[PDB]
Every structure is written in C-alpha cells, then in structure tokens.
Design a protein around this ligand. Sequence first.
Ligand code: HEM
Ligand code: HEM
Ligand SMILES: *[C@@H]1O[C@H](CO)[C@@H](O[C@@H]2O[C@H](CO)[C@@H](O[C@@H]3O[C@H](CO)[C@@H](O)[C@H](O)[C@@H]3O)[C@H](O)[C@H]2NC(C)=O)[C@H](O)[C@H]1NC(C)=O
Ligand SMILES: *[C@@H]1O[C@H](CO)[C@@H](O[C@@H]2O[C@H](CO)[C@@H](O)[C@H](O)[C@H]2NC(C)=O)[C@H](O)[C@H]1NC(C)=O
Ligand SMILES: *[C@@H]1O[C@H](CO)[C@@H](O)[C@H](O)[C@H]1NC(C)=O
Ligand SMILES: *[C@@H]1O[C@H](CO)[C@@H](O)[C@H](O)[C@H]1NC(C)=O
Ligand SMILES: *[C@@H]1O[C@H](CO)[C@@H](O)[C@H](O)[C@H]1NC(C)=O
Ligand SMILES: *[C@H]1O[C@H](CO)[C@@H](O)[C@H](O)[C@H]1NC(C)=O
Ligand SMILES: [K+]
Ligand SMILES: [K+]
Lengths: 446, 446
Amino acid sequence: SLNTDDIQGDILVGMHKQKQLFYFFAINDPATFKTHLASDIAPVVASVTQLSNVATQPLVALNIAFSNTGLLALGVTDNLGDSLFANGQAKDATSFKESTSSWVPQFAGTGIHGVIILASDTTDLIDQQVASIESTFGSSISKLYSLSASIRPGNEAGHEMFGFLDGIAQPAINGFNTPLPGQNIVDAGVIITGATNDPITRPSWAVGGSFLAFRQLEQLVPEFNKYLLDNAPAGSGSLQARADLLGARMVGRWKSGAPIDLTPTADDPALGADAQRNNNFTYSHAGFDLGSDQSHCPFSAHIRKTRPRADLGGSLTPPNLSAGANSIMRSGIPYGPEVTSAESASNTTTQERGLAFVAYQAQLSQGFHFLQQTWADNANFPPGKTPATVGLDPIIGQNNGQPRVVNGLLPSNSSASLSIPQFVVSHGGEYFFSPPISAIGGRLSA
Amino acid sequence: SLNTDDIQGDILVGMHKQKQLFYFFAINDPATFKTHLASDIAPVVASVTQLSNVATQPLVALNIAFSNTGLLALGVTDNLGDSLFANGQAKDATSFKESTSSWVPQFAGTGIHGVIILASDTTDLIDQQVASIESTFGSSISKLYSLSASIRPGNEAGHEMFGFLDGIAQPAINGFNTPLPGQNIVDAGVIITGATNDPITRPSWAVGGSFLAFRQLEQLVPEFNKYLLDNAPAGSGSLQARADLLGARMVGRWKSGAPIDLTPTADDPALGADAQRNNNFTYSHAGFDLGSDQSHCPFSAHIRKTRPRADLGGSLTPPNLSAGANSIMRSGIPYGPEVTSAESASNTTTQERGLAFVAYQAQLSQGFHFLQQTWADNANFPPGKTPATVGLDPIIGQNNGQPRVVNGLLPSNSSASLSIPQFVVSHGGEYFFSPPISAIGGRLSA
Ligand code: HEM
Ligand code: HEM
Ligand SMILES: *[C@@H]1O[C@H](CO)[C@@H](O[C@@H]2O[C@H](CO)[C@@H](O[C@@H]3O[C@H](CO)[C@@H](O)[C@H](O)[C@@H]3O)[C@H](O)[C@H]2NC(C)=O)[C@H](O)[C@H]1NC(C)=O
Ligand SMILES: *[C@@H]1O[C@H](CO)[C@@H](O[C@@H]2O[C@H](CO)[C@@H](O)[C@H](O)[C@H]2NC(C)=O)[C@H](O)[C@H]1NC(C)=O
Ligand SMILES: *[C@@H]1O[C@H](CO)[C@@H](O)[C@H](O)[C@H]1NC(C)=O
Ligand SMILES: *[C@@H]1O[C@H](CO)[C@@H](O)[C@H](O)[C@H]1NC(C)=O
Ligand SMILES: *[C@@H]1O[C@H](CO)[C@@H](O)[C@H](O)[C@H]1NC(C)=O
Ligand SMILES: *[C@H]1O[C@H](CO)[C@@H](O)[C@H](O)[C@H]1NC(C)=O
Ligand SMILES: [K+]
Ligand SMILES: [K+]
C-alpha cells in the first residue's frame, strides 16, 4: 500500500518524455505564490499512477520540489529530518572534493527556493508551459536558472553522452516493483520519506515525498574518447575495440548495456537489451576469489562502486541484496548538443554537454552523498580487496581537480594503475524535497 | 538576367521552414573567421534556386548578412552606397520617434557584426547546427544575442501574433515573379543591389545582395484585443463582431486575409485564401470620392499606409503600380509563446511575443525607413485626403511613446479620432547587408 496517487511521478517511474526542463526559481511573494501553488500547480502535478499509464500521461508532465530556503520562504519551519537537505548542496561541496568556484553561480548559494521539472515530447510544448507558469505567478517568482535536457537522438536514445546505455539498474521497491533478475529489492522507506521502514520521523504532511539531489555534470566526451584510444590495453584486434573494452571496464557495462561481469572480453548487444538478463549478476564467480579477481569487472568500475553487490556481503548468487539503504532512484537526462565534427576532429570540447543528474532517496546521507564521498571518492572502497587500493571511480570520482588514480582497469595486470583526468566536471546543483502531491495544495500553500 | 543561384534565398522567397533563429554575432579574429566563412559557411548558404524546389530544401537553411562594422572587421572598406546602413539602425531610431531605452541592449550600438539566419522544421535541428557553427569557428566568433522565431501553430500558421494572415502581399519582381492580380510590379533593382534599374553604384562583389532591415517588434496581444472590445463602434452586430471589424479596419484586412477594401462589412474567408482575388484592389471604387471615402478602408489602415496604391495616383483599376521604388520584400516571422490564459484573463502581457520583422531592399531610405517615417508615422499621409489628418498607422505608427491619433477607423464618422496606445513596441534591431553567395567565399573571405 504505497499511495502512488500521491507520489510525484519522477521519483519512482521517471517522466517518460523525450524532453525535460529544470526551472530553478525564487519566491518573491509567499502569499501570492501559495495561491497559485494550490490553485494552478497542485492539480497538474503528475503522480506515479498518472505517469504509469500511457493513457493518463499529460502533454506536459510537471513535478515540483523545494529547497530548504524555499520551505522557509513559505513559512514551513518543520524539521524534515535531513541535515544535508537543510544546509544545501553548496555547503556540502567540500565532501565531494570540488569547489563551488566551478559551479553555476546560482547554485553556489541558497537563493534557489525550488525547481520545476517539465517533461514533454517537444521543447515547443515545454516553452508554452513555462510561459503559462510565469504569467500565472507573475511577480511572485523569479527564474534564477534553467537547464534543458533530452533523450539523445536515434540509436543513442536512453544512452548518456559518453554513449553508454543508461537507466538499466534501479532499486526495486518491495511491494511496488516487479523485481528483475539481479535487481536489488528494498523497503519503500529507502526512497520515500515516511514509507515502510524509514527510520526518520517526518512531518505527517511530508509522507510520500522524496529528496531530490540535482547535479549538473558536464562530460568531456571528445577527451574521454581520445583517452580511451590513447590508453587502450595492448592486445588485439582493432584499436577502437580495445578502446571500447577499456571504456567498458571503466563503467562496468558495454555501451550496449551488456554488463562486463557477464561478458568480460567482448560486447553482447542482445544481452544488453534484455531486461531479464542484463542485471543478473553479483560480481561473484565460481570459482574465482571475490577479493582478488578483477578479470570480470574491475573493483573501481562505476557501477560496482555505486552498487557493490556481493562486495558488501549477501547472496553470492542473484539477487544480491546488500546495502539496500544506500540505493538511489535515478532520473538523470543528458543535456547539451551532440558532439560536433569540429570537436571530434580536434578531440576537444567547445560546447557544454553532459548529464542533468537527478537522484531520489529518503536520506541524503545514505544515498547520493554517501555514494559520492564514501564509495566513489574513496580510494580504499570497496574494502577487503587485493590489492587494497582500488582507486577512485573513473567516471565520477573526484580529488580536488587532480587526475584520478584508478586501479584494476587493465585486464592483464590488476596492479597496473592509471592516472585519469576528470572527464566529468561538476557545475554543482542543489538538494530539494519533492513533496507528496497533497502537500502542494495542502501544507505548503497554507 | 537575375542570377538566382547567387541570391540568398530569404531575400526573394523566404526560408520555407517552421522555425528560425536569428543569431547575432561579433568577429573576434578576422583571419580565422574568414577561413571558416569560405570553407564552412559559403558552401551551405541556401540560394533562391535551392529553396524554390520542394525536393532541394536543405535540412537546415542558412543565410548570412553583415553590419557595417562587420564588413569593417573583415577588412572590407568599400562603399556599399547606403548611408543608413553605414550608420546602423541605432542612429536611425530618432527618425521613427522611438527611444532606444526599449531596445535590446545589444542592438543599441554597432558591436553586432552580422546575423546568421537558421531555418528548420524543428528547433532541435537548429540547436545542433548552432553548436556545429560555434565549434567550427571557435573563439573567432561570439554570440552577442539571438531571437527564436516560429510559424504559429495549427490554424494560425502563417498568421502573425495579432491573428492576421501574413505574407499575402509582396512586390512582384519583373522577370522573376509572374504577377498576381493587383500585385505591384517592380524592377529587380528595387530589392537586389546592382540589379536592373538600381541607380546606386555598388562594389562589383555586392551585385546580387540586399539590405536586410531587422526589427524585434513586441506585440501586446491581450491589450490589443481589449482595446478592440472597449472601442468597437456601437451597432446591432455582436460585440465580438464589432471588435473584429475595428481590428480589420486597423489592418486593412480581416484575419482570414480578406482585404476590407473588397469586403468592408464582412469577413470572407474564401476570399482571404485566394491569391487570385485577395490582392486585386486599388482602393478606388465607382462612384466614391477617393479623397474622402473611408467606408471601404480607412486612410490610416496599416497596409494602406504601407502600400498606398491609388492614393499615390496611377491606375484606378488593378493593378496599381504607384510607388514601386518604395517596395519591400517581407520575410518576417512571429516570435514568443502563444497568449496564455493568465495574460488573456488579465488583459495584460507578461511574456514577450511579437514579430521578428525582416524587410529586404536595395535602398534602406526607399524601403523600411521610408515606410516607417514618411508614411506610417505621418499624420498627413496619404496626401490630398479630407479630412487632411489621416492620423498614424494604428499598427506600427509611432509618436515618442505617446498614444497615436488615428482617424477614419469608425465607419460612421470618418472625422472621428481615436487615441491609441502603442500595440507594438520596438526593441530595435540593425541594418545588415546580405551579400551574393559568391561574395561569401569570395571577397568577404579574402
Ligand atoms: C556524468 C556522470 C555520470 C555518468 C556518465 C554515469 C554513467 C552511468 C552508467 C553508464 C551507468 C550504467 C547504466 C545503468 O546501470 O543504468 C550508471 C549506473 C549508475 N550510476 Fe552513474 N553516471 C554518472 C554519475 C553518477 C553519480 C554522480 C552517481 C551517484 C553518486 C551515480 C550512480 C549510479 C548508480 C547507482 C548506478 C547504478 C548501479 C547499479 O545499479 O548497479 N552515477 N551510471
Ligand atoms: C509587429 C508589427 C506589424 C504587424 C502586426 C503587421 C501586420 C501586417 C499585416 C497583418 C499585413 C497584411 C498581410 C499581407 O498583406 O501580406 C501586413 C502587411 C504589410 N506590412 Fe505589416 N505589420 C507589422 C510591421 C510592419 C512594418 C514595420 C512595416 C514597414 C515599415 C510593415 C509593412 C507592411 C507591408 C509593406 C505590408 C504589405 C502591404 C501591401 O503590399 O499592400 N509592417 N502587415
Ligand atoms: C540469473 O543468473 C543465474 C545464474 O547466476 C541463473 O540461475 C541459473 O539458471 C540456470 C537455468 O538456465 C540453472 O541451470 C540449471 O541447473 C540445474 C541444476 O542446478 C540443471 O539440472 C539444469 O540442467 C540447468 O542447467 C542454474 O541452476 C541456475 N543457477 C542458480 C544459482 O540459480 C538464472 O537462470 C538467471 N536468470 C535469468 C532470467 O537468466
Ligand atoms: C480583379 O478585379 C477586377 C475589378 O477591379 C476585375 O475586372 C472586372 O472583371 C469583370 C468580370 O470579367 C468585368 O465585368 C469588369 O469589366 C472588370 N473590370 C475591369 C476594370 O476590368 C478582374 O476580373 C479581377 N480579377 C480576378 C482574377 O478576379
Ligand atoms: C585526435 O586524437 C586521435 C587519436 O589520438 C587522432 O587520430 C586524431 O588525429 C587527433 N586529432 C588531432 C587534431 O590531434
Ligand atoms: C603490474 O603493474 C605494476 C605497476 O604498478 C608492476 O609493478 C608489475 O610489474 C606488473 N605486473 C606484471 C606481471 O607485469
Ligand atoms: C478584460 O477586458 C474585458 C473587456 O474590456 C473585460 O470585460 C474584463 O473584465 C477584463 N478583465 C479584467 C481581469 O479586468
Ligand atoms: C464626428 O466627427 C467629429 C469627431 O471629432 C466631430 O466633430 C463630429 O461632430 C462627429 N459627427 C458625428 C455625427 O458624430
Ligand atoms: K540525510
Ligand atoms: K538608402
């Protein structure tokens, strides 16, 4: 009995649209804002139920979430029970070993009172909806910043900007999702505040909400590509295939989405396209030593860093259920143009492109923030490996701008390290709370 | 005669696409810019020939034009024979009785070196093409400003923001256009620099170009609509019907495109859509006194102010050929979102919409500038009327921000004045030269 009628769509199902806009606003007139929040927004906020039926999917799907300062501006002083949310992402940046100096300037503070997520299959429709929202609210709000995002073109649809199939792996909410082979299975309360086994006491009105960690993460695609080529493990055959292999071993999947744990030496596109198979692994293999074998998947690969499965205990055969509480739901969408001829030929980025990163979780210290700082950025995670130093996550791992020392990537010697420049650059973001839909025309507009 | 392979398509035929972007740039590094102008831009500039064939429409249509300062940045010091162009449009603002205070800051100066016009059926395609251009030119080009424009949706396609069908009336170029009934017929040299009967000496490389007068004109649609309702002449017809009549008498056409001169009391949508009938008039009528009769069409109506036809003498029967030299080719396209419910409910604009106005002419002083100052803004034009005070063009007439005095609009009393707020607000623009295509990889790249 998850009340999915009351849970904003993006949290659990995604927006299921081709285009999205992230519209970051300030509140100038609380009393006026509340009237329109309740009269005009509340009724068109799309729920999990609504979005889960192609029939009830609106022309423009709308979610809305508030920052700590946004809640304060609405006179909402209740403790939501999350100190990271409360203090905002800017004050948290040092945890991830970046400086707000590279952030979108409007992220580098707490001026942003909220974000509106618009999703639609054309940008035209999105723009008409922005117009409609702005004229409705009038002077009661100001736009501080916005970021447009879309599913990438054609064959690359649902792939991110480095070209890897994305959205494969999510936590399955016990009692809501039908678990796929290999998929972790977790209490609703890991993602939904006040949900089953959420140990943190919430204001009653906040029950059915989630915390949104937003991140604007630029990707240097041409530079990535060239680095793969330059450091492709010796072997055969073609240089591109060995570059692809190395790419794969960095992420933990081929670009087709085939997990390398199941197919370590060559891509398998059909496997990648198969929901019944492509997540059905734990990192354990009979009979290799889990603590020492990186021949299937490096200890430092992105996905193994972010969901370590058998690395943290639990069943060696699918499905592993370890570290449930550290699950996140991901609704990230690529942003920016495709790589151009000029950028590709010069192996140099000129146009900002990347990932509009969106993670949902009931406890920020358990989810995005934990994954970034305690796992991905942690040279000694996961524990109990030989060699002991795993190095940083080659995708997202940060060290105050320094190139990242990453181990295990080279199939023929797992002691062989690489020094890897950042290919993902954080321009920061903010922590929001995505209230249940009843709070929008309810408590928050009170 | 007219080498249409060498004439940029928008000048004579328009871009024939749903979306346009006007990309205003500066040149930072002329040597490098030239390189890419020749190798990258010239080859993809869309000619009149290419655009006139349904099956050779480019995926993205590109035209390009330069300001005086842009030409200078390219080491082209030749006299194009146009003093208004040389000065730029900021210095001309006084002529139109408008303050630069309302101008896009980037237009109020001569820092803009040119404009790239992109046209496509989606904005996605334009966005990717912008990225391609910016990556190719690198730091040698800089974006100073841009305006996105679009054909209006559904049944308003081809209508401007006030809701009137547009693009019905253009000069027919002798030898190029087969004239329609009523259409003015002009020498090619009225539009194309150095073409037939262009009296002005041009640099040889400039033969086959045109002057592009760009204007960003905001339209206050809700305000316009309200003004019509509040000022509609008393009558037995419905309120909406009498409002529409007033609107049509302001424009000189009904929204369907029907010219009121031919149908003064009723819309006729069959007429509006028929290119054979919908321009076939002179303003003359047996036996009415051309000098005093405003029952068919007010002397002050927009199209009558901008093509006076028989008001400037010549044939009383179609086609009238007066004032050929004061003709402009029009490539304007609406911009901004559709009117929202909030704005409509309130009768108040909050979202900027209007017309991205593009006029082409071989002499700025005979075309746009002439039409704005000598005709539209002149309370005594057209001449020889009774009463003498025609008033201003209700659509575009300007009086230093003051309400415009407009006479003749009320069928029942041709002496009856209305004091009309601006419905259109100039946010300025610039005068550019669109060169022949040969010049783009020729002289301008040299
Ligand atoms: C631009 C930067 C990023 C890129 C290119 C990237 C790329 C990917 C790719 C290709 C996958 C595998 C596809 C899939 O399983 O659906 C993936 C999975 C994942 N990523 Fe990221 N990612 C990025 C940032 C992040 C961040 C910042 C986090 C959180 C700290 C994160 C957490 C995850 C998680 C949890 C998974 C799924 C792991 C699993 O279920 O096995 N990623 N990422
Ligand atoms: C946003 C402001 C404007 C609006 C809403 C507007 C509206 C219209 C409309 C509805 C028509 C009739 C369509 C047609 O005959 O093709 C028209 C025609 C025309 N307009 Fe405008 N107009 C605007 C600005 C201008 C300006 C600034 C000029 C020049 C100074 C201009 C010159 C013309 C001309 C020459 C015609 C054709 C008249 C004829 O050949 O009989 N317009 N306009
Ligand atoms: C997910 O992956 C697991 C492997 O980790 C798959 O489990 C395995 O499924 C196969 C069926 O193809 C089982 O094979 C069978 O084994 C029995 C004896 O145990 C034998 O008599 C049969 O001839 C057959 O080979 C295998 O036992 C089983 N292993 C485990 C540990 O469960 C599972 O099928 C995968 N799921 C999907 C949807 O692919
Ligand atoms: C354009 O309008 C003119 C009227 O101004 C039409 O000319 C008239 O046509 C009718 C029918 O042939 C004749 O009876 C009149 O004698 C014509 N008048 C003149 C002065 O020629 C002309 O037919 C119209 N053209 C179109 C295509 O409808
Ligand atoms: C980019 O890198 C690849 C491989 O390193 C190479 O083939 C290509 O020539 C490089 N381009 C430039 C401009 O250096
Ligand atoms: C593995 O790489 C390391 C470099 O860190 C090196 O010391 C060692 O010789 C390599 N192992 C083999 C078998 O070559
Ligand atoms: C808008 O104008 C119309 C016509 O004048 C009027 O009936 C209506 O009350 C106005 N709306 C508002 C909100 O003032
Ligand atoms: C209308 O014409 C002018 C408007 O000012 C006025 O002087 C005259 O008296 C009016 N005539 C009628 C019949 O209303
Ligand atoms: K927390
Ligand atoms: K001139």
